[PDB]
Amino acid sequence: EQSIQLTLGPWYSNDGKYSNPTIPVYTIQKTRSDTENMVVVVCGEGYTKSQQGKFINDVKRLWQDAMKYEPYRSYADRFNVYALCTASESTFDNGGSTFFDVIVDKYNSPVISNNLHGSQWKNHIFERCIGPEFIEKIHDAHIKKKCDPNTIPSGSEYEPYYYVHDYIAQFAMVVNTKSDFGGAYNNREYGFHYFISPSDSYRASKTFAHEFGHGLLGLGDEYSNGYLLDDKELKSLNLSSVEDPEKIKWRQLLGFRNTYTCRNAYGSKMLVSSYECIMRDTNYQFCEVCRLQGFKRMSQLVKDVDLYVATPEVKEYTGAYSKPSDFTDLETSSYYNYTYNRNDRLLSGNSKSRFNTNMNGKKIELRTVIQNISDKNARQLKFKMWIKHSDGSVATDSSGNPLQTVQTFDIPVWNDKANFWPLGALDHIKSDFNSGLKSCSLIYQIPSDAQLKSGDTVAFQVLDENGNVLADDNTETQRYTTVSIQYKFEDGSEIPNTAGGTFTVPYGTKLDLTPAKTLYDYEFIKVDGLNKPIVSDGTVVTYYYKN
Ligand SMILES: [Zn+2]
Ligand SMILES: [Zn+2]
């Protein structure tokens, strides 16, 4: 029913196997107007027409797993996700004609092969054919096509299609295969912004999150080798070759969580902010630098995100790893020695119970990093930290003074915002890592006469100017709950060509997004389940549309 149709002349389907394909469109998630959200378009490679059910379910699995990683997770409901059911003649594993002509080269890279059948523009198919048709017919902006993709434009072959990657935030191609591979193609100047990954490899979801991190977040391979020259130093979001801790771009994050610059391998001149990152080893999470940069990157594509507060931590303050000179050694063993010291000192998250009565007379530090997303509003955040008894009462010293301290932090504006992957950008060239960024550290001296009890813990809050709690001593370990969206007509029928996905939110979250006024051609009526604490897995938010 709902679909797009392409016209693929000899430059896109030289063997005539896909000269005029019909592509069913499935909406996996549309929580707001496309104009307000990041639009992701996923196509299948090597799925035959009878395998499109598998393709849809593969996309839902990969997408849901990607949304469990920060920083995506913080934006989970600000994506609209569409599955385009591109049908191949052959399965991928059978090796016959496929929709995207994908081959695996001698480096294990999946590549769209223009030379396979002589389709000279095959790897331009996303931004010249699929994208413009989708943006005209399906996307809420309905930008009418500007150029015939089977003709040579006057002037640039590329500029007429630049707009595609501003209305579609990411193209993904899922290959129907168990083969383990992955590749991301980011060259917007020449029209390329897609990645390819497999549906059923042993690490399929981790690979998907990684390639999406290259493609959408603009992060570099923390497995890369070589020395970054000054231009490439400024260009990289998450890599460096600057040995001096007083000069390295991410110096404000040094000592926060597992942020300790090190060589990404013995004797390497390529430096990473943490040895344990998915951008180097797909078994890990995103490091704090990648979370910050990716969160900043996505904030450019939506309008209502104005602050990043990394999850704060509390540590016994001994003076270790508290000054730049403590970070000068860049060997892997220095990274791990640092993380062991951090664990020995940690008093938050899963180490909250390490507090004890021997803590009197000691100092503790509440530490996080804050990025202002506004290029016009400076911010002032108030930090509170205190010693809490197990029953919730606030501990005191021997004079009845509560064991508590407060400090306010000024967050400067993001003056450099326009240089960091804004809408319309073709690349990231140079940005000031520290613009809008503020590492906040609140040190509390526990008095020698603290009246501590077994089971006491460190409590804390990060408050905004209205007193809203942005983060506290429960944030890091709080339970997340799964929510699933469904699209229905007034009469309870499921809307065709929808396949509502799930995502997760902190237990108790009240969802607050404004539904898109249209779904395909159907007009929105009402929604059940918004503005209501989400307190059970499988909670269903139901969007009702008028038939
Ligand atoms: Zn990679
Ligand atoms: Zn990283």
**Number of the ligand closest to the Cα of 275:** 2
Burial class (CB in 10 A: 0-12, 13-18, 19+), 510: exposed
Compute the half-sphere exposure of residue 240: CA atoms within 13 Å on the CB side of its CA: 20
Kindly provide the residue ranges of all beta strands, DSSP E only, lying in 118-265, ordered along the sequence: 170-175, 183-187, 192-198, 239-240, 262-263
SS3 readout for 81-95 = EEEECCCCCCCCCCC
How far is residue 260's CA from residue 320's CA, in Å, rounded to a whole number?
Answer: 13
Distance 111 CA to ligand 1 centre (A): 14
Q: Cα Rg for the chain, rounded, in angstroms?
A: 25
Residues at the binding site are: 210, 214, 221-222, 277, 287, 290
Distance in angstroms between the alpha carbons of the first and the last residue of the chain: 14
* Beta sheet of 239-240, edge-to-edge order: 239-240, 271-272, 262-263
Separation of CA 367 and ligand 1 centre (Å): 31
Question: Please, what CATH class does the domain formed by 3-215 belong to?
Answer: alpha beta
Give 279 Cα–ligand 2 centroid separation in angstroms: 5
Note the CATH number of domain 480-546.
3.10.20.320
The three-class DSSP label of residue 349 is: helix
Q: Which amino acid is at 201?
A: S
Strand partners for 470: none
Ligand 2 center from residue 140 Cα (angstroms):
34
Residue whose token pair is 């890599």: 239
The H-assigned helical ranges of 151-264 are 164-167, 204-215, 230-235
Sole residue written with tokens 């002589």: 118
**Of all helices (H) and strands (E), which one includes residue 66?**
helix 52-66
Place of tokens 């008093």: 347
Handedness of CA 76, 415, 165, 487 (dihedral sign): positive
User: Measuring CA to CA, which residue among 481, 484, 503 is closest to residue 543?
Assistant: 484
Secondary structure class of 427 (helix, strand, coil): coil
Contact call for residues 188 and 165 (beta carbons, < 8 A): yes
* Residue 296 and residue 238 in contact, taking contact as beta carbons nearer than 8 Å: no
Q: How far apart are CA 506 and CA 510, in angstroms?
A: 9
Q: What is the largest CA-CA distance in the chain?
A: 87
Q: What's the CA-to-centroid distance between 278 and ligand 1, angstroms? A: 9
Query: SS3 for 353?
Result: helix
Rounded CA-CA distance 517/530 in Å is: 16
195 neighbors 182 (Cβ within 8 angstroms): yes
- Determine the distance separating the centroid of ligand 2 and the alpha carbon of 104, expressed in angstroms: 27
Instruction: Please state, in angstroms and rounded to a whole number, the distance separating the CA atoms of residues 383 and 205.
Output: 37
Experimental approach was X-ray
- The helix or strand, by DSSP H or E, that contains position 408, with its residue range, turns out to be strand 404-411
Q: Which residues contact 155 (CB under 8 A, 6 or more apart)?
A: none
290: CA distance to ligand 2 center in Å?
A: 4
Amino acid at 121: W
Indicate the SS3 state at residue 160.
helix
| Sequence spans of domains, the chain | 3-215, 239-472, 480-546
What is the distance in A from the centroid of ligand 2 to the CA of 359?
34
24 upstream amide cis, omega within 30 of 0: no
Beta-sheet pairing, 38-45 with 79-84: parallel
469-439-215 Cα angle (round to 5): 90
Question: Could you tell me which residues are annotated as the binding site for Zn(2+)?
Answer: 210, 214, 221-222, 277, 287, 290
